[PDB]
Amino acid sequence: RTHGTFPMHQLGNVIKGIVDQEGVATAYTLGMMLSGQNYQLVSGIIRGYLPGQAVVTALQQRLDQEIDDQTRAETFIQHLNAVYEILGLNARGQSIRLE
């Protein structure tokens, strides 16, 4: 299951378009509102579109902490922004610092 109302791809149309335009956390967010609270889908989709291994690591780190099963989702993007805090990304999934 990927979509019912929003004309998503076979997985996450919203996600790609947004990762480039607004960044992963928005692509993530919109994947959440459009596809539903299907954390599995968004995390699977954006994980490949995540800035680098660090952003997914940080996000996974948040998931490792796992507040709950659904609460992962509830705070999934909050955790992605937390990611931005961890590694130094901005809202656009871009790095504001140089490594």
Could you say whether residue 17 binds a copy of itself (CB under 8 A)? yes
How many Cα atoms within 13 Å fall on the side-chain side of residue 97? 7
Q: Compute the distance between CA of residue 51 and CA of residue 85 in angstroms, rounded to an integer.
A: 14
C-alpha pair distances (Å), 32 with each of 19, 43, 62, 70, 88: 14, 10, 17, 12, 24
Q: Which stretch binds a copy of itself (CB under 8 A): 5-13, 42-50, 64-72, 73-81?
A: 5-13
User: From residue 32 to residue 51, what is the string marking binding to a copy of itself with x (rule CB under 8 A)?
Assistant: -xx-----------------
Binder of a copy of itself out of 2, 11, 22, 87 (CB under 8 A):
22
- Packing angle of the helix pair 39-46, 76-87 (nearest 10 deg): 30
Binder of a copy of itself out of 25, 26, 45, 55 (CB under 8 A):
26
Q: Which residues are at the interface with a copy of itself (CB under 8 A)?
A: 3, 5-9, 13-14, 16-18, 20-22, 26, 30, 33-34
